[model samples]
Target chain A: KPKVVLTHWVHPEIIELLSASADVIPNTTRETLPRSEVIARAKDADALMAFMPDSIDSAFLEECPKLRVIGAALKGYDNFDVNACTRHGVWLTIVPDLLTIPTAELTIGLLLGLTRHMLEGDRQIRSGHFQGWRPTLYGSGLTGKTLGIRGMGAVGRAIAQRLAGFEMNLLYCDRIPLNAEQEKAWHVQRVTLDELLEKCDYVVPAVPMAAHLIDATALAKMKTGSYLINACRGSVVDENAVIAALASGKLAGYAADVFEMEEWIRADRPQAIPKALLDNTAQTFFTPHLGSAVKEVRLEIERQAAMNIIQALAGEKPMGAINQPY
Target chain B: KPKVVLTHWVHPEIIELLSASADVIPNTTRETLPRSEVIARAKDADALMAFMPDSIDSAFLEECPKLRVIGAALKGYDNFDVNACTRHGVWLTIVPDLLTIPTAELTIGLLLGLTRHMLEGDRQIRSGHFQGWRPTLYGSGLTGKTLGIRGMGAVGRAIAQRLAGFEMNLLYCDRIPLNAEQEKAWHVQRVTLDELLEKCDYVVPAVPMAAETLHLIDATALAKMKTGSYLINACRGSVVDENAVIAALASGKLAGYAADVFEMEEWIRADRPQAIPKALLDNTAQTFFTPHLGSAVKEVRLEIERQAAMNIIQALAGEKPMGAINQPY
Candidate 1:
């Protein structure tokens, strides 16, 4: 049987399916193994199921002589050395599109939660500080508002679909205008990025992690009273620029589920929480990188990952093969 | 000029409008006065602008021999003794319709606030106890769920209209079925009160305070909850057996807002903190209540009070009065 070594434990059903098709050596370690140990164990394996904690680099790739495929347990493949994998003729696969709706739902929830001061209100009441009701305790309302989606990808489109009922003016800035069906169905209007910045009440960054999507000058282009919701990869936003915007009150609130340094933090190194996160008073909500933590969605993602692995072993291009031609 | 004694300070704009038409004695006491003082002062006034705290009864009526009309500063005239006012040929007027949308909007905000545990989650993070995210933090979504409205008044209808975008299944229990326009516009279905109790994900009591509505949601109704459903009342649901519902929740047979007693608590009382507001707890996202401040919209309330004063003045002039609840002499 072809040797397949899993670097960490996955969903039980996924483990069972992988074991049926290969000589599966499941890692007994409860947590992710060190890079050295991962390379040591995965060197001779024909395929390796990997997770975020293990760093796959040029040195590790040179050691894994028989490896033909690297199946990432998560969507992001930043932990994998794509160049090394390409040079070694090894394919990399990731689970994509599985968490689009779940993450989009969370993005909208965070936007509403931040703008309405729902958290602050709850805290006041719970701490026995709710001094009855007063007329001045106000929150922003969503009626007839504008929602600007930064990228019109799957997750952004899903959010637009759900918010369709609110009668919000949907402004999207993309490479091309939306098709007639998309515009009519989602009530979306194509606009320049600068125009979207000025018009939207809630400006959401839904693009993938790329260079120069939102730098310092880009954040300055946004309206003063609008909210910023960033659930996509954190690098898409300039952390320092966002902090300045928040400090200057150029933005009403910022809700981020992913930060630029989230991977390092999740690795449990003792570092101070980001100043933008810590010093924002009640205007910021930082979820611990949990945009994909919905129970059903996470399970589905793991199942899809297992199916991709099986398809690869059966000599067919896997559902989400990163190196394959489209 | 007609003699008018204002029992308490109203909105300055309304006070100015009343002063334009009559000899007004503005009670400089910013705070509520004793009952004895109100009766004594109101004895000789031709017109009195009343607030909820001031008692208007037969004793006050007997004392106020010159009183012609009583204008309520609020929409509800429940505190006023209608029979006593009618017997003495004293005209009564109340403000209405000004606060419907504002109150309904608040109700929706409160519902979303409570169901999503938004407040509790914020508290957890602020208090430095929030570690990270978990998968099981389940909140009720508004889409495709049943919202049972207990009353079908203007406030209830407004809430239904706002919730139209959510595509919620609208079920209502009222004295009558809604008209075709209302049913079609809101996509509402009229159902029996019992069915509304049994079937809805959210049971909102949007009725007024009345002899019939008081304590209308009782122990039997609380017991009929389908596990995780919520019961919300932006109305006077205090007549419900509070202790019985509390006991049912304690036994895990029902889940709901636990501060039902506090809703009826006197706002001015010092002993109010003794009662625990359990609805503020993290796990009890099912229950929620606010201080009876629904009609707290400032501008709308001022306009309504001014309108009531206008109606009272019109009635005394032998003209057709606006919002006349009783036939004129």
Candidate 2:
């Protein structure tokens, strides 16, 4: 039987099914093992199930000479060194596309909370300092507002669809423009990044973090009095620049679910909390990275991860094989 | 010139205009005068400008025997005993239909705050208890939920129109059924009170406060919660058994508004500081209220008050007036 070593416990039903088909060596530890331990243990494994905490670099791949396939229990495979996996002739698979709607829904929740001053009101009431309502206590309504999407991907499209009820004018900036059907469906107009920043009331960065996506210079181009929302990978935004923007009130509000180096910091460390988290601005709303935390989405991801492992073991290329060449 | 005793300071623009037309004896006192002084001074005045704080009883009307017209600065004429004014043959005029949209807009704000858990979240963050967001934190959405309107009056209809974009299923219970066009425009259905209570996510009382309408939302009606709904009374539904609701919330039988009583107390004593102002539970999510300042929409109320003053002056002249009473006095 082909040996399969899971670095961490996954959904029990998937474990049971996979164990029935192969000799399974499951890590009993609830948390991720140290980098040295992961590299040492993975050396002899025929196949491996990994997660974000498990390092899959060249050093780890070199030790795992017998490892034929790696299945990640997540949507994004950015944690995996795809080039190294490809070079080592190891098949890498990930569960993607299932988390789009849930992430989009969360994005909408964050956007509404920021624009409508929901968090500010919550703070006032909880502090025992709630003065009664005044007529001029105004919040910008979503009606007749423009929504700018940084990426025209699946999650961005889903957000556009959900916000259609609000009658928001949708503007998007992407390398590849959307087709006619996509345009008609979402009421999206392809615009330059500068144009999007100038016109949008709510700007959502929905793309994965790349080296130079939204650095300090990029943020300077955005319009004042507009809210910024991010449910995408945190590194996509320059954290320092964002903090400055919030402090200066150049941006009306800021809401984000992810932060760069969030996973690396120790929980007890003061630096573990992002600078953005420290901001008590009435406009700032921060969430612990929970973009795809909805039950339906999590279940779908687990199911897909199990299916990918089973298919790879059966001598068929998995549906989401990240390392598979075109 | 016709002698007009200005009871209190009216809007400066209105006072100036009224002074131009009549011998306006403006009361320089910044506060409401003593009752004896009011009676003594305005006894022979041809016209009198009044407000709610003033006592316009039969005796006062008797004292002011020459009082031909009473211009009320407010919309509701209940302040001036209408029967006394009618008996004295004094023409009574009131500002009306001016504050409908502004009041309705505030009601919508409160409703959204309640439904979206905006107020609750605000309270949590302000208290410094907001650690971070979790996915399971659930709030009821306005989309595709039934909105039960107790009265299908102007305010109710306006609220229904504003909420149309939310695509809420609107159900109304009124004294009479709404017309086909009214039903179609609002996308609402005429239903019995019992049916509305059973089906609605939000129960909004938009009716006027009257003897017949008082305590309409009694204990028995509140007990039926087929879907654990919220009750919003921007109107005076506090005339209902508030203690019953307090009991209901305490026993977990209902998720009552925590600040409902404070709001009621504020309405009753508009100028007094809220008695139980800083109670922790008073900051709870389900309840919200403001001082009864709805008709204070500056531009609209000024226009309405101006029109009412004009009507009062025209009526005293025995000419056909705008908003003239056609029914037999």
Candidate 3:
């Protein structure tokens, strides 16, 4: 009998789903099992449900030859070596647009908090700083600011749609531009990456996690005193370079939904957030890997992951498969 | 010289504009001067630019007979009695839309903060409450909720226009309803005060300060609000019964009470900040207060002062001011 192995906890409904066709290894322990243990359990399993920070390279793949399908309940598949997965004839699936609203909401929340001094205002009132509407307390409003987006994916365009009422000039820089009708409807102007960085007041990078995407020189090209929102992969940006720009006042504020290092967010581990971010807490907004933390989004992602595993195991083309050649 | 007695300093450019045509009495002192000295000084002046808490009534009017134009660079002329202004033949003018954008922005800011649990999430992360993204933190979004507005004045309408992108159901309660085109354009529904109070998820009061408006949104009206809803005030503070709002907040029938103005808002400039309701302030997670900061922006303040100067300057020249809240009839 074929089996489906889940790395961590998921919706109870998903376990029932695999039970109809195959034996299921549900994570009743409520913890991410170790690599050796997961490999032992996955050795005889036909499918595996992966998560963020999971190492699924050739070494790990060789021991699990029976694992024909990998379903990642994450927006990014950077943790999976696509070449190795395809080489092993494993269909790799990733949940797409599952965290769009929740991610976009956090990005907007952080931006509003940064631009309008939402956090500072609350702190002042709470900490006996309610000296009342002095000239010192005034901050910028979002009515007519320039908002630039680095990627024109679902989350990026969703943000533009949500903020359309705020009446900001929206700019985009992506591999390919939206069509003329879509650009006119969304009121977004397509520009080059340099132009986006040079002109935008708030630059948001929605690109997937990749190395060398945002380095010191790239960040330096961004408009001085501008802001940044990263609701995407952490590895795309260099923490040291971002810290340097922040310290030099080149970047006035940064709202990072993704940390460059995962340990900074994992509660079981000591915080690894660099001293640079902590020192400039006033100009920063931090969330501990909560972009897809919304209850509905999380459950939906689990359901999507389970369906892909079930479909791929049944030899029906999985819905979110990344390797088209497979 | 028909003197323009400045009760307090306005924008420098406004002072210069008024001074270009009249004998300007600029009160360069750091504080709003004592009432007695101001009355003594304004006894011979033709125009008076009275800031907040400066009463313009019969007692002060009888001493200053030459005060023909009272330019109040304020959104509400509650401190300037309507009958007293006409009885004394002072053309009272106010900056109607002066606080429109800023007040709307503050109201939206508070709403976003409350709905998204921005403050709670922030505090938990800022302090040592970092237990990771456990199932404890969850909040509602503003995309599909209902927003109710009391008093559809400039600020109320502006709030509706700004939030049109949020795709919320907008309801408003006012004495007169907007026309068909107006309602359709703003995508708002005209409802009675009771309906507004009962149906809204976020209740905002944007009315002017008046005798009738005082304590209008006391416990009885707010009891109809949806549970776990927020209430933001961008208008007068006394319009809401503070004690009732606080009690409702404790009962868990309300989420938060955020006010941009206070009861003593006009009286407060650089003095001791007005005391917030004890219970509300103590519940730091729920309440937010900003002391009448809607019109204090550098750019907006200049525009407000300019509007008042234009009205007052035209009035003293025997030309009728735009919003002549008085007459020589």
Compute each candidate's TM-score over C-alphas.
0.66, 0.56, 0.71
The deviation in Å at residue A142 for candidate 2 is 0.8
lDDT of 2 by residue, A120-189 (tens): 4444445554333323223565546788998878777777765654556888888877789978866789
Each prediction's DockQ? 0.16, 0.10, 0.23
* CAPRI level of candidate 1: incorrect
Worst 10 residues of 2 chain A by lDDT: A129-138
Tell me the RMSD of model 1 versus the true structure. 7.1
Error of 3 at A94 (Å): 4.0
List clash counts for every candidate, in order: 4, 8, 0
lDDT of 1 by residue, B37-56 (tens): 77777777888888766667
For the predicted complex of model 3, DockQ is 0.23
The residue-level lDDT of candidate 1 at A287 comes to: 60
CAPRI quality level assigned to candidate 2 from its DockQ score:
incorrect
Global lDDT of each candidate = 0.67, 0.65, 0.75
- Per-prediction CA RMSD (Å): 7.1, 9.0, 6.7
Candidate 2: tens digits of C-alpha lDDT, residues B57-99 = 8888988888877877666665567777777877777766665
iRMSD values, candidates in order: 5.6, 7.6, 4.5
Candidate 2 stretches greater than 4 Å from native: A1-48, A58-69, A81-91, A124-137, A208-220, A263-277, A311-319, A322-326, B1-329
